Design a protein around this nucleic acid. Structure first.
Lengths: 97, 227, 83, 109, 95, 97, 83, 109, 95, 227
DNA sequence: ATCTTTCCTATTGCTTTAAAGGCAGAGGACTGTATTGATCAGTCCAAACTTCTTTCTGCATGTACATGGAAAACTGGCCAAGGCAAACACGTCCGGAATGATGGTATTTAAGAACAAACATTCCCTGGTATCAGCAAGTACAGTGCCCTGCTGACAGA
DNA sequence: TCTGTCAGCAGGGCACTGTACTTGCTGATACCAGGGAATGTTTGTTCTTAAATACCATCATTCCGGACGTGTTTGCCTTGGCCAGTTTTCCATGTACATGCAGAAAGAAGTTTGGACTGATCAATACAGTCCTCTGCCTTTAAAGCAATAGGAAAGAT
């Protein structure tokens, strides 16, 4: 019988792992592509400094991490451990977003 | 009570290059809340002038709008083969929006998806969607317009997805009901107890909540036929 | 040259990693599209402000200063690029 | 003849530049006039805040058996203190990460 | 010649060597400290400017800076910053 | 037997009544006493303009109404209709207070 | 002359009316003490800034303009009092 | 000869004061210099926003069979429009009240 | 004598009479409108000042005001405000 | 490695209205992180000077401290009738805080509430609270100090209610355990495996998270006696 | 209690990023003059505080009980964990060109000063909107009565 | 002697009636917004000066595109565990509705406090020119940290 961790064990291990570290969690190249895709709707033939894309990725990841913290609090408020889309919606609504 | 809108030149003919002037008169003051439209045959109307002087997005400077109060006019300077269409003036200075009688002229990304043509027997009800994309859904009202060969364009009502607030034309009260679904970004138009005269083409058009804004983008239209 | 559909480049594993850093243990299957929409809205607003700042400068390159100013204007001050 | 010039930072006992701060206040379009004690006071306050954060970050680096302060240590210093976190509650530290915290309900039984 | 870029790096490093003689600091940490100094400078200066405007004063004196510090910094941070500022001004006045 | 509305009917009636109106819902004199009491800890022998107390009351009532809206959303999130202190705590936490 | 216990002056029916204007149909018994604590914290925060503004002007009367400035400093702008 | 004075508001076709706006820009410590068209532009924008809010408030008053605009009508105008509500999202309007809304789950049955 | 207090009451009243000839306005509503006008003025002016400072310019021109309007006002409000400002400046320059 | 603190005068006598000086020598550099306390008999200490030169709130200017590095001194200018007390120097420049031996001098609203005296048999555990009021509870740490006639004042540990962080003296690791209850704004001190030497008076003191802040307010002191 | 997997700890190399040293220019300091914003003492009246007195209206307390919240149980399905193959992200390297920065000219435009007057603020008055009170009119809530459908005891068939 | 079916009874659901609340109209009145009048101070006009900015050319720095190779990450599929959702029950705890008490509100007067205007004046800051030295950019060295390998210990699952 191959070894298996029960559900929730590797989840907690990953929580500790990614709270201990500080590296960016989104892949850099696809995020750069997304940034360029969005920007083309406002001004064609734009150029981006590398530091500009790095700053955008830092801001977006910090924002998403904070939103997920609020979402987790909202999910726990409903006596759940799974986060649903309605939890994100409630977090955004209370935040005023 | 409703503002009757009169376009004096019911039809006209012109050649290339020469100037044209189309006048539209209001029975009551509307304070420059007038919009001009161009409708090719079997196509949704497109906006030319809004607020009686401002040029709509993407429209060349050949079109010129002027007037205030109750007298308004539309001017085209350098005519082309592309200018063969019907032109309407729309006033939205008062609650029941009234289109002009229309003027036939002949020369010798925001998107609103709409359903295709539908056949229905009298007495039933029909529900025609209007799926919008390319902009913030809640920030713009969705207007509904009925076009017939006899009565021309008629304003039905609108729903504001931001707060689901609706305003109906007194003629279509009860007959028409509007609802919206923010998740799908779709607005539904319900017609109850279809009659022979209810056969028409129904357009959904985007209008901002701003007072001077007009119906700027139109759906392709859903043609409803009643046996 | 053109770019069409890179929002799907924010993959499910990346969203799960972001949630893990946020302390999430269990994630619903519908969280990923919701997160993609939220991220797209946030990026659209920030990039619009940054591009406005860039255009006012009559430049055609978006600098890190433009992004920092755009984030600051939205109450999301970012340290580490202010120079 | 002119006496030996003495930098105002030394005259106030500070490390931060009083002269540069005065020039930035004058050129910042904050007021028509700027007093003599305003740059000294502002430089002292800025130096105090810098020293406080730096000392907390250095203690955090020491606890990790590290010799150099990185953004992670600044994040740890700021977010482990109620007053600094309240001051910088709307601020994102690049490469700072987050504090390791897990809700008690999520832990295994 | 290239345009010079001013920063608080040398002063931040002086304060670091004053509080931790042994520990160093990375370039990114130094940039974060520069951003922090600029941000707090802007906050205090803007609050002092608004204080002066409210009272119809043309001058930002040490009183405006002190009131801005009291309004901005929370708790004991404010009182310690006020103590440091008062000490610096008192020492400066005696030259 | 005397007429008696079932629980929740008068609650909805009062909801409509107080959402229709605009007047201040806290009594003037006790709120003024509270305002003077709180200021007593910062400086003694303070005086207040009547407009100052009016502005404070307006701000406080607006803040409380908004906070109760968020609390009600939080309570509905947990499949309840009764607001509880945990709902206020969650609303304030998500608001960053 | 000394005031000690006016927080109880924010009576139960007043809090009920405030909740009703917010759309609350049902209220727990413990909501009132929590609401009083929240209101006390908010009033302390606002009045501290108002009194700071008053003291800087070397006045002894807290004007409505001081309250408006204190509120605006906290992202709670109030129209209608000379703003 | 000396020309008769003509106010810049009438020259720009505005009702709001271009001269007062220019003086406020100069006195507010916003910049060392102020361009000629800046006060005209700012007065025009302020007049536009004022006209928009006033017309919405007047429509709200008409819907209520009232003749004068009160703060309640301003609140109704602002909060029934997504763009104005976003512009004034963090603003409290004295004697404005709130919009009538009851969550659907609370209604009977 | 006592100091004169300035307000936008007369101009707000003129605009109201332009848009609603028969509608009046209460004193409290006029106070709210004065507060709104001052607040929007302060927002736009501050944003324009920051725009000028970022670009190292000493002059706030109509370009700075236009960019501030674009940044602050959301959606169609920005477009219509820009249109009105451009129209006003064009008319002012024409005369 | 712990910093030994040496007060040069162990006792002294002085008449009213003449200066006295108490010196406190630090084993290792502490960089001006020194505080001075006055403890009248059967009462909790009160802070006089913090950061080695700054007067505490409500302390008259007669008291003055000086020094930095490893040499510090306290000076009282005009000896009032009530100045007779025991004076301690506390260093908090390094993690294990240490008090001075104490100088017994004789001559010719923030509040922390503590429980009363408790008698406990050897081997059992005791849990003494420290109720706090008059300030933002989570903004300040609560510091616990043990006083005995033989060993004098000894620092146990602290609890930070903002994040429940704790730090303990090695002499009390395992012996002591601090917990906080933000709902009641109370901090609990837990002692386990009581012995004869654990009979002491335990004080809880408030201290800000700021580095230069010292133990500014103290509790009444819970006297614990082990049979 | 035992087996498996993960994390943590300790060497050793090498890598790269921090720290030290040097030069120039631009910006900070020093001295004196002008002047201008701000301090200090008087005075007045606008407004804040204090007290009294009705006058209720709203708050507080108490009683009956309806119903919403919380616990228990139970199951379906939705998500975690692991395996394997392929995608494509990361690194890196070079070519080309678009763009930002610098310098000199010249060119438009804004600051500053002085005077006239015209626009804005404060006072005064009045009349039209809005508030209050009484009486119908409509709406909706709650309970009762009449009609209807499914379950169970006794009858009829087998 | 055994089993299925029908009338009586229990439980639901729709319609009618009593009743409380909110709205709508009419009339009276009271009080707040709007129009007319005098002062002061702030805006407009004209001219000069200078300084901020447009434009044009050039250099060089940096960004975009493409190309290849390695190997870590993502996608898809399978298995099964445990968690979200549903149903049931009970009870305690909020809601609704008396009745009585008292203090909040409003009008009035009296007292008092202090915010702001006025005048004199005086201490501090801007401006200017000069000198010099502090800080930023360039260059070179070495020590903290990352990576690879191996071993130990803690923890999960059985």
């Amino acid at each position: 019988k191959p070894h298996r961790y029960r559900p929730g064990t590797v989840a907690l291990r990953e929580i500790r792992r990614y709270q201990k570290s500080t590296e960016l969690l989104i892949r850099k190249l696809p995020f750069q592509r997304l940034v360029r895709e969005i920007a083309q709707d406002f001004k064609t033939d734009l150029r981006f400094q590398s530091s500009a894309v790095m700053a955008l990725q830092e801001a977006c990841e910090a924002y998403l991490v904070g939103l997920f913290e609020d979402t987790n609090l909202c999910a726990i408020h409903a006596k759940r451990v799974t986060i649903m889309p309605k939890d994100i919606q409630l977090a955004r609504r209370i935040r005023g977003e | 009570m409703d503002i009757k809108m009169t376009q004096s030149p019911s039809s006209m003919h012109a050649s290339l290059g020469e100037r044209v002037t189309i006048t539209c008169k209001a029975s009551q003051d509307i304070r420059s809340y007038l919009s001009w439209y161009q409708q090719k045959p079997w196509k949704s109307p497109k906006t030319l002038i809004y607020y009686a002087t401002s040029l709509a997005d993407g429209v060349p400077s050949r079109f010129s709008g002027s007037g205030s109060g109750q007298d308004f006019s539309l001017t085209i300077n350098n005519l082309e083969s592309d200018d063969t269409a019907t032109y309407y003036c729309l006033q939205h200075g008062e609650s029941p929006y009234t289109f002009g009688s229309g003027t036939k002229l002949e020369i010798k990304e925001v998107q609103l998806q709409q359903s295709g043509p539908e056949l229905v027997e009298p007495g039933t009800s029909v529900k025609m969607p209007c799926k919008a994309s390319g902009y913030t859904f809640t920030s713009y009202t969705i207007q509904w317009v009925k076009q017939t060969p006899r009565q021309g364009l008629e304003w039905i009502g609108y729903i504001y997805p931001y707060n689901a607030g609706t305003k109906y034309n007194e003629k279509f009260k009860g007959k028409a009901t509007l609802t919206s679904d923010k998740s799908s970004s779709t607005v539904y138009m319900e017609l109850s107890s279809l009659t022979s005269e209810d056969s028409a083409v129904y357009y959904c058009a985007r209008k901002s909540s701003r007072l001077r804004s007009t119906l700027d983008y139109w759906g392709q239209g859903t043609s409803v036929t009643v046996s | 040259k053109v770019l069409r559909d890179n929002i799907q480049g924010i993959t499910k594993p990346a969203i799960r990693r972001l949630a893990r850093r946020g302390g999430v243990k269990r994630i619903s299957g519908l969280i990923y599209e919701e997160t993609r929409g939220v991220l797209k809205v946030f990026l659209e607003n920030v990039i619009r402000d940054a591009v406005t700042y860039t255009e006012h400068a009559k430049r055609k390159t978006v600098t890190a200063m433009d992004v920092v100013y755009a984030l600051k204007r939205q109450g999301r001050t970012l340290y580490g690029f202010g120079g | 003849a002119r006496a030996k010039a003495k930098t105002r930072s030394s005259r106030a006992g500070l490390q931060f530049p009083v002269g540069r701060v005065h020039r930035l206040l004058r050129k910042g379009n904050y007021s028509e006039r700027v007093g003599a004690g305003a740059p000294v006071y502002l430089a002292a306050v800025l130096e105090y805040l810098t020293a406080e954060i730096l000392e907390l970050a250095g203690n955090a680096a020491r606890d990790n058996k590290k010799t150099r302060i990185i953004p992670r240590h600044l994040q740890l210093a700021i977010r482990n203190d109620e007053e600094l976190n309240k001051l910088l509650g709307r601020v994102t530290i690049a490469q700072g990460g987050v504090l390791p915290n897990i809700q008690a309900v999520l832990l295994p039984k | 010649k290239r345009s010079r870029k001013e920063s608080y790096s040398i002063y931040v490093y002086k304060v670091l060597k004053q509080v931790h003689p042994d520990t160093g600091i990375s370039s990114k940490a130094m940039g974060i400290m520069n951003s922090f100094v600029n941000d707090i400078f802007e906050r205090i200066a803007g609050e002092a400017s608004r204080l002066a405007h409210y009272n119809k004063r043309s001058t930002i004196t040490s009183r405006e800076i002190q009131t801005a510090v009291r309004l901005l910094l929370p708790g004991e941070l404010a009182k310690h910053a006020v103590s440091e500022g008062t000490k610096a001004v008192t020492k400066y006045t005696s030259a």
